[PDB]
Design an enzyme around this catalytic site. Structure first.
Site, PDB file in Angstrom:
ATOM      1  N   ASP A  99      22.802  42.309  73.512  1.00  0.00           N
ATOM      2  CA  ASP A  99      21.487  42.676  73.015  1.00  0.00           C
ATOM      3  C   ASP A  99      20.877  41.625  72.109  1.00  0.00           C
ATOM      4  OD1 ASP A  99      21.701  45.347  74.191  1.00  0.00           O
ATOM      5  OD2 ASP A  99      23.373  45.519  72.751  1.00  0.00           O
ATOM      6  N   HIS A 141      17.063  45.673  61.635  1.00  0.00           N
ATOM      7  CA  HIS A 141      18.417  46.021  62.062  1.00  0.00           C
ATOM      8  C   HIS A 141      19.488  44.995  61.681  1.00  0.00           C
ATOM      9  CE1 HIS A 141      17.054  49.472  64.219  1.00  0.00           C
ATOM     10  NE2 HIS A 141      16.449  48.804  65.188  1.00  0.00           N
ATOM     11  N   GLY A 149      20.220  45.036  67.578  1.00  0.00           N
ATOM     12  CA  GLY A 149      18.914  45.567  67.963  1.00  0.00           C
ATOM     13  C   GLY A 149      17.811  44.536  68.105  1.00  0.00           C
ATOM     14  N   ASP A 177       8.916  52.408  62.075  1.00  0.00           N
ATOM     15  CA  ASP A 177       9.415  52.115  63.419  1.00  0.00           C
ATOM     16  C   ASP A 177       9.959  53.369  64.114  1.00  0.00           C
ATOM     17  OD1 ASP A 177      11.588  50.871  65.425  1.00  0.00           O
ATOM     18  OD2 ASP A 177      10.281  49.237  64.803  1.00  0.00           O
ATOM     19  N   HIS A 179      12.724  53.449  65.487  1.00  0.00           N
ATOM     20  CA  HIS A 179      14.155  53.484  65.233  1.00  0.00           C
ATOM     21  C   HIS A 179      14.464  53.489  63.738  1.00  0.00           C
ATOM     22  CE1 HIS A 179      13.468  51.722  69.214  1.00  0.00           C
ATOM     23  NE2 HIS A 179      14.520  52.446  69.567  1.00  0.00           N
ATOM     24  N   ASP A 268       6.609  50.877  68.294  1.00  0.00           N
ATOM     25  CA  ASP A 268       7.232  51.562  69.421  1.00  0.00           C
ATOM     26  C   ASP A 268       7.124  53.081  69.337  1.00  0.00           C
ATOM     27  OD1 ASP A 268       8.947  51.219  67.201  1.00  0.00           O
ATOM     28  OD2 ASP A 268      10.545  50.321  68.401  1.00  0.00           O
TER      29      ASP A 268
HETATM   30  C1  LIG Z   1      20.213  47.507  80.462  1.00  0.00           C
HETATM   31  N1  LIG Z   1      21.028  47.027  79.353  1.00  0.00           N
HETATM   32  C2  LIG Z   1      21.703  47.814  78.455  1.00  0.00           C
HETATM   33  C3  LIG Z   1      22.345  47.042  77.537  1.00  0.00           C
HETATM   34  C4  LIG Z   1      23.176  47.510  76.374  1.00  0.00           C
HETATM   35  N2  LIG Z   1      22.424  47.598  75.125  1.00  0.00           N
HETATM   36  C5  LIG Z   1      21.177  48.362  75.213  1.00  0.00           C
HETATM   37  C6  LIG Z   1      20.733  48.946  73.884  1.00  0.00           C
HETATM   38  C7  LIG Z   1      19.393  49.645  74.044  1.00  0.00           C
HETATM   39  C8  LIG Z   1      18.861  50.155  72.712  1.00  0.00           C
HETATM   40  N3  LIG Z   1      18.768  49.075  71.727  1.00  0.00           N
HETATM   41  C9  LIG Z   1      17.618  48.783  71.063  1.00  0.00           C
HETATM   42  N4  LIG Z   1      17.715  47.942  70.024  1.00  0.00           N
HETATM   43  C10 LIG Z   1      16.629  47.853  69.242  1.00  0.00           C
HETATM   44  C11 LIG Z   1      15.453  48.565  69.451  1.00  0.00           C
HETATM   45  C12 LIG Z   1      14.321  48.616  68.469  1.00  0.00           C
HETATM   46  O1  LIG Z   1      13.151  48.697  68.841  1.00  0.00           O
HETATM   47  N5  LIG Z   1      14.674  48.650  67.184  1.00  0.00           N
HETATM   48  O2  LIG Z   1      13.746  48.903  66.171  1.00  0.00           O
HETATM   49  C13 LIG Z   1      15.470  49.350  70.597  1.00  0.00           C
HETATM   50  N6  LIG Z   1      16.528  49.481  71.407  1.00  0.00           N
HETATM   51  C14 LIG Z   1      20.038  48.374  71.515  1.00  0.00           C
HETATM   52  C15 LIG Z   1      20.602  47.851  72.830  1.00  0.00           C
HETATM   53  C16 LIG Z   1      22.068  45.679  77.892  1.00  0.00           C
HETATM   54  C17 LIG Z   1      22.445  44.443  77.371  1.00  0.00           C
HETATM   55  C18 LIG Z   1      21.997  43.276  77.971  1.00  0.00           C
HETATM   56  C19 LIG Z   1      21.175  43.326  79.087  1.00  0.00           C
HETATM   57  C20 LIG Z   1      20.789  44.543  79.626  1.00  0.00           C
HETATM   58  C21 LIG Z   1      21.242  45.708  79.022  1.00  0.00           C
HETATM   59  K   LIG Z   2      11.703  53.977  61.187  1.00  0.00           K
HETATM   60 ZN   LIG Z   3      12.138  49.983  67.173  1.00  0.00          ZN
END
Ligand SMILES: Cn1cc(CNCC2CCN(c3ncc(C(=O)NO)cn3)CC2)c2ccccc21
Ligand SMILES: [K+]
Ligand SMILES: [Zn+2]
Ligand SMILES: [K+]
Length: 404
Positions: A99, A141, A149, A177, A179, A268
């Site tokens: 990520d 994050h 994140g 946010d 999250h 978001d």
């Molecule tokens: C589909 N797919 C799923 C993964 C695994 N990790 C996914 C999560 C999804 C959720 N995630 C995430 N982080 C920050 C935010 C945000 O907006 N924070 O304010 C939103 N969402 C962490 C990562 C992954 C890694 C690399 C490429 C593709 C892949």
């Molecule tokens: K928040």
């Molecule tokens: Zn967010």
């Protein structure tokens, strides 16, 4: 005045990541297309006298070994050869993977947000600006030695550290946010002088997982009761989100009497974000954007304020929102009406706003999908009372209680 962080190199770096592409350029060019730039003081991103001075600034929060690894990750991605197994393991030990992967400018990109938010803090401290905006920052994050994140360096923590260390100074942090603002909350877990408040979605398996029942943890040591959280169910609309957060914000201001406010304004929560969790809008009337409601309320306090970006994965609609946030901030600080055409003006990125080229996001509001909020208000009120007692702050219990 109202300040805003930008610059040509800053723009190039903030547009250099694979995750956020040219989002920052759309944001700043939409603000420019609406003729708001002449109303704003440009705050130049902070630059340093030496590598040592840069390291001293960033390691006010992050570990030297994490900063070293992040810089090495950039070097390695500017060479064609694959990483060695030893280097893969090193990056994994700081969660620089999946990520939060490497790319050729990962360090300069992450550092740039720190440069912008530290400069913004300084502009507040020296009183050059009453409010400063940084739409290239808000990466809530990242942890001391861990990327998370899509966040690599925590510009918010570093900015807040600079504010609290200026001259007792208390900072109120508000995280709008979608999250949970876990990195900032964790950094200040033991500090009563930085009160953190995050409103967010939380549910099983939803990132990052914190900001909800665990009972509610709320700080430790002298920071007990100083970390506030409001988790909300998916589907919430502008009005219900505004009513959920409004009395909490007002009561925090009354009791904490902050010297500075720092707001994270991740976009978001918009109904049109690809997350599609909350149903907030950028409307400015009969729905009023939860974001605009919150910012107007925070700014009515007349406390020096830092407004930061964050999430937002629908780039044109993130620009639509932050342009309205920027216009509202000018209007509230300067007392000067900002009139914004409902029609997107012609400019470089006009084609990105099709097919209808309107400033309102393309959404038709309705009732929230989901009592729970009342229980949270009772809990948060009790926590605020506990915070005020632990820290010997005086406050009218019933002026505060009547806000609800
Ligand atoms: C589909 N797919 C799923 C993964 C695994 N990790 C996914 C999560 C999804 C959720 N995630 C995430 N982080 C920050 C935010 C945000 O907006 N924070 O304010 C939103 N969402 C962490 C990562 C992954 C890694 C690399 C490429 C593709 C892949
Ligand atoms: K928040
Ligand atoms: Zn967010
Ligand atoms: K705290």
């Amino acid at each position: 005045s109202v300040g805003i962080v930008y610059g040509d190199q800053y723009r190039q770096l903030c547009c250099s990541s694979p995750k956020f592409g040219d989002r920052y350029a759309l944001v700043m060019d939409l603000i420019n297309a609406y003729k708001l730039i002449p109303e704003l003081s440009r705050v130049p991103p902070l630059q340093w006298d030496s590598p040592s001075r840069m390291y001293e600034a960033v390691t006010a929060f992050h570990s030297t070994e994490y900063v070293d690894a992040l810089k090495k990750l950039q070097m390695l991605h500017c060479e064609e050869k694959e990483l060695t197994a030893d280097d893969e393991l090193l990056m994994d030990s700081f969660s620089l993977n999946y990520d939060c992967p490497g790319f050729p400018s990962v360090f300069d990109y992450s550092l740039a947000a720190v440069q912008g938010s530290l400069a913004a803090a300084s502009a507040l401290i020296c009183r050059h600006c009453e409010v400063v905006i940084n739409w290239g920052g808000g990466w809530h994050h990242a942890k001391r030695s861990e990327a998370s994140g899509f966040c690599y360096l925590n510009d918010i923590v570093l900015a807040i550290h600079r504010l609290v260390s200026s001259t007792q100074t208390r900072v109120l942090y508000v995280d709008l946010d979608l999250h949970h603002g876990d990195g900032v909350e964790e950094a200040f877990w033991y500090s009563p002088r930085v009160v953190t408040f995050s409103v967010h979605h939380a549910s099983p398996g939803f990132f990052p997982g914190t900001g909800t029942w665990n009972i509610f943890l709320n700080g430790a040591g002298r920071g007990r009761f100083s970390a506030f959280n409001l988790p909300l169910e998916e589907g919430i609309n502008d009005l219900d989100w505004s009513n959920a957060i409004g009395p909490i914000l007002d009561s925090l201001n009354i009791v904490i009497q902050p010297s500075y406010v720092v707001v994270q304004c991740g976009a978001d929560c918009l109904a049109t974000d690809p997350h599609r969790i909350f149903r907030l809008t950028n409307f400015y009337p009969c729905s009023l954007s939860g974001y605009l409601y919150a910012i107007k309320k925070i700014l009515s306090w007349k406390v020096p304020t830092l407004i930061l970006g964050g999430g937002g994965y629908n780039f044109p609609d993130t620009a639509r929102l932050w342009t309205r946030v920027t216009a509202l901030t000018i209007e509230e600080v300067k007392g000067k009406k900002m009139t914004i055409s409902p029609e997107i003006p012609e400019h470089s990125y006009f084609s990105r706003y099709g097919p209808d080229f309107e400033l309102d996001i393309d959404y038709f509001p309705h009732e929230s999908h989901n009592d729970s909020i009342q229980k949270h208000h009772r809990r948060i009120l009790e926590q605020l009372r506990n915070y005020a007692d632990l820290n010997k702050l005086i406050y009218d219990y019933d002026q505060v209680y009547q806000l609800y």
